[PDB]
């Protein structure tokens, strides 16, 4: 694309985004810079973005200059999950104008769309549990001078560990790419042909039903991963 090739066109959308949450001109919204880590060159399932936070000097010696880069990492992971809720929203919204007086071709095409929304809606809810509730439980009741550096160093490690970015839960994460790429194929077609999206749907079912088996088997290697099999399938082999 012509836009999004520099850290200064998305970096002004940030100051536009802060006003629409009523969270702007605060010290909380201070020291925000927005950059990319990659030029778009791809099923682009990746998202290129970095956000940083920083604080004034006598607190900055505890909040290290290596931890903020890993904040930028976990940020791009969640945003990579958001890209699905944009593209799936796009394909159902392109389908919405082809409705009132529908036929077989309308209802079965939304029958495909629902479960791909549903998959992402439960993996996003999984990460919207791990990086926000349990690792925050041990960084909101884990704040009681060297010990503060130690507790914060536990917080970041748990946020990347329970987010499955680590190599321990990497075979679970590898199947998620196979889901996401089929959704990106599913997004381009509206109908140009109804069966071509059905093929991507039928492959997506195979990969979801296999994601269950690999994440149930990989508890032998993870107490945090015990939740994820249960998110992604509930009372369903």
């Amino acid at each position: 694309p012509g836009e999004l090739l520099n850290p200064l066109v998305l970096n002004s959308v940030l100051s536009k985004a802060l006003q629409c949450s009523l969270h702007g001109d605060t010290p909380h919204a201070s020291n925000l810079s927005l950059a990319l880590k990659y030029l778009p060159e791809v099923p682009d399932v990746l998202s290129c973005l970095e956000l940083r936070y920083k604080v004034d000097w006598p607190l900055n010696i505890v909040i290290t200059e290596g931890c903020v880069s890993k904040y930028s990492g976990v940020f791009s992971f969640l945003l990579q999950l958001k890209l699905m809720m944009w593209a799936l929203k796009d394909v159902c919204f392109h389908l919405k104008r082809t409705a009132m007086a529908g036929s077989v071709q309308f209802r079965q095409l939304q029958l495909f769309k629902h479960e791909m929304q549903h998959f992402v809606k439960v993996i996003q809810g999984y990460i919207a549990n791990q990086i926000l509730h349990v690792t925050w439980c041990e960084f909101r009741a884990r704040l009681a001078l060297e010990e503060i550096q130690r507790a914060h160093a536990e917080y970041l490690h748990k946020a990347v560990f329970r987010g499955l970015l680590t190599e321990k839960a990497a075979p679970v994460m590898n199947v998620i790419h196979s889901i996401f790429s089929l959704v990106l194929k599913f997004r381009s077609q509206l109908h140009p042909n109804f069966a071509l999206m059905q093929q991507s749907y039928n492959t997506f079912k195979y990969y979801s039903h296999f994601l269950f088996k690999v994440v149930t088997k990989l508890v032998n290697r993870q107490p945090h991963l015990e939740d994820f099999l249960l998110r992604i399938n509930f009372n369903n082999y």
Partner: peptide, 19 residues
């Protein structure tokens, strides 16, 4: 609730109970 095995769902699609 998963290992209680209390609700019986629909065998064509992969839904979940979503909390």
């Amino acid at each position: 609730i998963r290992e209680r095995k209390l609700a019986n769902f629909i065998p064509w699609g992969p839904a979940s109970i979503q909390v």
